[PDB]
Fold this protein.
Amino acid sequence: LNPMWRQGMFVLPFMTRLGITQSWGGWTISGETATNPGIWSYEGVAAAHII
Amino acid sequence: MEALVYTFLLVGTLGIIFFSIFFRDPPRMI
Amino acid sequence: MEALVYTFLLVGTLGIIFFSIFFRDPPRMI
Amino acid sequence: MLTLKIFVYTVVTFFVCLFIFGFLSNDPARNPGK
Amino acid sequence: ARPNPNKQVVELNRTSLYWGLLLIFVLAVLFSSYIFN
Amino acid sequence: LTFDEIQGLTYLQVKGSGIANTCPVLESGTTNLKELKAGSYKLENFCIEPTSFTVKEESQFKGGETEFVKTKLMTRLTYTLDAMSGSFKVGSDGSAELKEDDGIDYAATTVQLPGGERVAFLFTIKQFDGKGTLDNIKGDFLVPSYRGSSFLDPKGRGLKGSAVFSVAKVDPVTGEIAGVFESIQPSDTDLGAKPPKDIKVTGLWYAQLK
Amino acid sequence: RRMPTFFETFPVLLLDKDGIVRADVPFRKAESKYSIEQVGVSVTFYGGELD
Amino acid sequence: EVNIYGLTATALFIIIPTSFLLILYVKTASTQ
Amino acid sequence: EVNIYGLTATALFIIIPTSFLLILYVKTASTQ
Amino acid sequence: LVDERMNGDGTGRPFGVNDPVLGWVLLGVFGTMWAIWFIGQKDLGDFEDADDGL
Amino acid sequence: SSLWARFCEWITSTENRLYIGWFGVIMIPCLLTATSVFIIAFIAAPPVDIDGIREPVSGSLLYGNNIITGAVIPTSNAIGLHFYPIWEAASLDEWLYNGGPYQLIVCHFLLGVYCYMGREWELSFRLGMRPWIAVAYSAPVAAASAVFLVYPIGQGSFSDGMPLGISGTFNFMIVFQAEHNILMHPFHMLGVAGVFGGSLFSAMHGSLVTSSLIRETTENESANEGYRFGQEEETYNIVAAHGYFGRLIFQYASFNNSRSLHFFLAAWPVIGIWFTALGLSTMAFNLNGFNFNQSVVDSQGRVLNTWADIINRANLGMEVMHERNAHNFPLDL
Ligand code: CLA
Ligand SMILES: CCCCCCCCCCCCCCCC(=O)OC[C@H](CO[C@@H]1O[C@H](CS(=O)(=O)O)[C@@H](O)[C@H](O)[C@H]1O)OC(=O)CCCCCCCCCCCCCCC
Ligand SMILES: CCCCCCCCCCCCCCCC(=O)OC[C@H](CO[C@@H]1O[C@H](CS(=O)(=O)O)[C@@H](O)[C@H](O)[C@H]1O)OC(=O)CCCCCCCCCCCCCCC
Ligand SMILES: CCCCCCCCCCCCCCCC(=O)OC[C@H](CO[C@@H]1O[C@H](CS(=O)(=O)O)[C@@H](O)[C@H](O)[C@H]1O)OC(=O)CCCCCCCCCCCCCCC
Ligand SMILES: CCCCCCCCCCCCCCCC(=O)OC[C@H](COP(=O)(O)OC[C@@H](O)CO)OC(=O)CCCCCCCCCCCCCCC
Ligand SMILES: CCCCCCCCCCCCCCCC(=O)OC[C@H](COP(=O)(O)OC[C@@H](O)CO)OC(=O)CCCCCCCCCCCCCCC
Ligand SMILES: CCCCCCCCCCCCCCCC(=O)OC[C@H](COP(=O)(O)OC[C@@H](O)CO)OC(=O)CCCCCCCCCCCCCCC
Ligand SMILES: [Cl-]
Ligand SMILES: [Fe+2]
């Protein structure tokens, strides 16, 4: 009932568009949790752009 | 609160009008 | 909100440190 | 974690060996001298 | 040539000063009511 | 290791490896259910391992049904209640009547949730009475108090769960009994300021009849 | 006892007519002897809104 | 509700190009 | 609750003396 | 156990080494650095008694 | 020619701007490691059980702490003096709970500042100066190592080290006064004399030299354009400054030699800081400060009170409140 586009979210539905579907908090987009976040989570993509 | 912002903007526009009229560079000759 | 202000101030202080170290005037001779 | 541990030992021992074989490599003659 | 042979100087006279300041305040006076809403 | 394989070691060899946080592994003793004589026995070293700590996440992401979620331990190797004892009858057909009185019966551990939220909870088998026949040895225990009544809140002011045993392997000679263990208990609450959470704990256990 | 100027959180005491403390609000609740629950001090109003 | 973001946006849109024009004017009128 | 006025005071105390120093530095380094 | 960890605290092992895989890296860095230094020995000062001191 | 010779020539060159040297290969990456962990952990560190009593402590900016209250929490007491790196932990959500980045940053930062002192030797030797800058830099190195290394060794836990933050520094200092009474200790008073005398001597020398600048400029422009860089003319009349000082106080407390004056400036605050650096190391091993409890006694045998007998009440008030949830047995802090 509270998707991404109700919140005014802008650059996260491009990472989710090209497949970045997991964060370091453990939560995902569809609702369940995934175990391994890997190097490439949302915060990792952001920090890589800062670098 | 915002009324002071409105009044400050109008008075600042009038002040720039004043300085533009009186403190311009003199248009000088040849 | 204020955490971004804190982080911006710390990063700006570090940036002025960086430009002060590397982009100084050269201390020149006689 | 072992993949990290090999890498940490590699970097540490590389820098320490660079240190030791730097100071064995003719240090007190790279001065302005006499 | 190690010093730059294209170091050039910006120039902005008093007429352009008054035009720019008047433009910025008129833009502010116009958009401020819609920004504050 | 087994029990004598553990006690053959000295303290200087157990110290620093994690062998101390284990039940001794029991040998081949499966399905000896007729090899069980009666008596009002006691247990020598009744140790119980956990092996998974799952928390009922009450937050919804699918519907009005919530499962148990595998998580991470947080403190360090701070589990496996030890040296428990009491009074432990074996009956006629395999009816165990197991009563726990003494020993280190409690251990306080913290556990996250995926989402970055810490939950502290006790692991207590204080004063348990399991009277059952070798498949669902049921009964309840106490969750005494998450913290003492003399606890200072940070500004200077100021139950029963479910537990199911099982029996897998039986030493016929010495009475060493292994098996699997499950339990569900509530978490810590700070006296009603935070609603509790259900926590399932699964593991093994060990005993030595006497 | 009235609060002095320096004290931000002055603790609650109850003086007699002379200056001897007869009750308190205890910071520690274990072995309290002069608590209002043990003594039984009532309050009466005079004047004001809740007269 | 008033835009507390909006008052900061107003003050920034005032001060930043004003200072930008003042730098160039003082640099210009310094020489002549 | 965060201040209504605090971020405005912070941004003003940043930007005003910064621009004041930049004007003088650009006027100085223009000549030399 | 519940989880997996090296359990290297309180052991008392030389250089904190657990695997021989972990042990070979010390020599594998030390010997190559020594070999590079021993090659670089060509362009240094080697001498009979030309000593650098008072 | 050879690779090693060219690499050594580059690393002992004096023309690259920030000098490196041979201590620099440990000074640079280790302090960059410590900085790169500290900036992350000052911003986004989860709460840390400092006490081992299952009470996490917030220290980072994201969890409701500003710049003053933000701090890197030290390691828990159950962790003790055990070396606890990342790879011995279970997860990075378990290493951060039990005081990880303090253990990493301190052990990095100490090696960093020792190799920085070695670098301050090395560049002086490479230029051809006299080598005693590192001797003066040995004082704040000792002052850092006493609170980060020596005192947690003495107390047996890395908990009682100084927390890496502004509001944590004072919670170190006040509890240190509670348990060890640092003010009633003669080394600490020597260090107070060191820092106050250092401020006095800096202000005094900077007054008496600026008060004698030989005029080279006018009175409209800056008074700092009178010194062209790299000259050979003494820009301050040190004869007139010494005459003014001798008229001001004493002629036998002269210090007419400029070099004797500079030795005195180099040796007052350094020897001032060395005695506090020893004082922390002595109080680390429970060699407590002074104690004047119940000294002034009347002719009967009753107890009178002094300022020491008020500081005893203040230290009792601190001691019965520090570490409020841990202590049960009546002593040993
Ligand atoms: C008038 C009051 C007064 C004064 C003047 C002092 C003075 C002093 N106290 Mg103190 N104190 C007082 C009252 C006072 N105290 C009271 C009332 C208490 C009781 C609460 C204490 C409790 C107390 C404690 C508990 C301690 C002191 C210490 C000290 C000394 C600290 C100076 C020092 O050594 O730093 C020297 C410099 C450093 C520590 C910094 C080292 C520099 C590092 C190595 C490099 C910095 C790296 C940095 C990040 C790089 C920056 C990079 C950036 C620019 C980009 C100094 C003599 C300390 C001490 O003994 O000193 C040794 C100490 O531990 N005091
Ligand atoms: C948020 C802002 C809100 C609006 C505020 C008002 C608008 C400010 C915009 C800038 C004002 C104009 C600046 C450029 C023109 C100027 O420099 O004059 C140039 C003149 C004549 O030019 C020169 O003057 C020289 C002679 S003399 O100086 O005039 O005597 C002479 O040498 C030369 O020939 C001649 O060219 O001389 C000056 O140098 C005087 C400078 C005065 C400018 C400072 C104004 C800022 C303060 C005003 C704020 C008012 C506050 C409220 C008051 C109650
Ligand atoms: C909210 C702020 C937060 C902090 C932001 C960072 C601090 C900004 C403070 C000002 C920076 C320093 C300005 C003064 C020094 C300077 O002018 O350099 C002087 C140098 C060398 O001097 C000269 O240079 C000439 C050669 S050359 O230009 O260098 O090639 C030469 O002719 C001459 O001899 C020599 O003297 O050359 C320049 O002219 C370059 C100017 C660049 C300054 C612009 C900086 C503003 C943008 C930075 C913002 C970063 C944003 C984030 C980036 C990811
Ligand atoms: C994945 C992890 C990411 C980590 C990211 C790490 C970011 C930090 C990197 C540092 C970047 C800033 C320095 C780079 C500029 C520099 O090299 O100077 C420019 C000069 C020019 O050198 C000249 O450089 C020439 C090479 S070049 O052509 O100019 O490139 C050379 O030919 C010539 O001989 C020489 O004179 O370099 C030198 O003088 C020495 C080079 C090494 C010195 C830089 C490291 C020192 C930094 C201090 C570290 C402590 C700080 C603690 C934290 C606050
Ligand atoms: C025909 C060749 C055409 C190549 C076109 C490449 C265009 C540039 C792409 C760069 C961005 C890569 C995209 C992210 C890629 C990425 O995210 O990888 C991700 C991965 C590292 O991340 P992880 O392993 O943790 O994966 C995440 C998951 O495992 C965790 O859930 O990298 C690899 O393991 C191998 C990658 C190889 C990438 C090769 C590129 C580098 C070599 C290229 C040299 C080409 C030279 C050609 C000369 C003719
Ligand atoms: C993102 C972070 C960076 C942000 C940067 C800050 C923002 C920068 C904003 C730049 C503002 C530029 C404006 C300068 C404006 C300025 O100074 O003009 C100056 C310029 C004069 O050019 P010249 O040919 O005369 O060159 C000689 C000198 O005068 C210029 O150096 O005029 C123009 O060329 C056109 C520009 C618009 C001018 C005519 C528009 C008239 C609008 C009048 C509005 C008032 C009446 C309203 C009626 C209701
Ligand atoms: C638990 C036990 C712990 C033991 C710790 C042992 C620490 C060892 C410290 C050694 C210090 C050596 C000091 C420098 C020694 C030195 O000054 O080098 C120089 C020296 C030769 O010097 P020269 O240049 O004068 O040689 C003569 C001619 O070259 C003259 O032109 O070489 C040696 O003697 C090496 C001695 C054995 C060094 C160890 C063997 C190195 C190779 C082993 C690596 C195997 C590679 C395997 C590849 C995977
Ligand atoms: Cl205790
Ligand atoms: Fe001086």
In short: The pocket of SQD (ligand 2) is lined by residues B 12, 15-16, 19, 23; E 14, 17, 21 (CB under 6 Å). The longest helix of chain I spans residues 6-31. The CA atoms of residues 6 and 30 of chain I lie 36 Å apart.
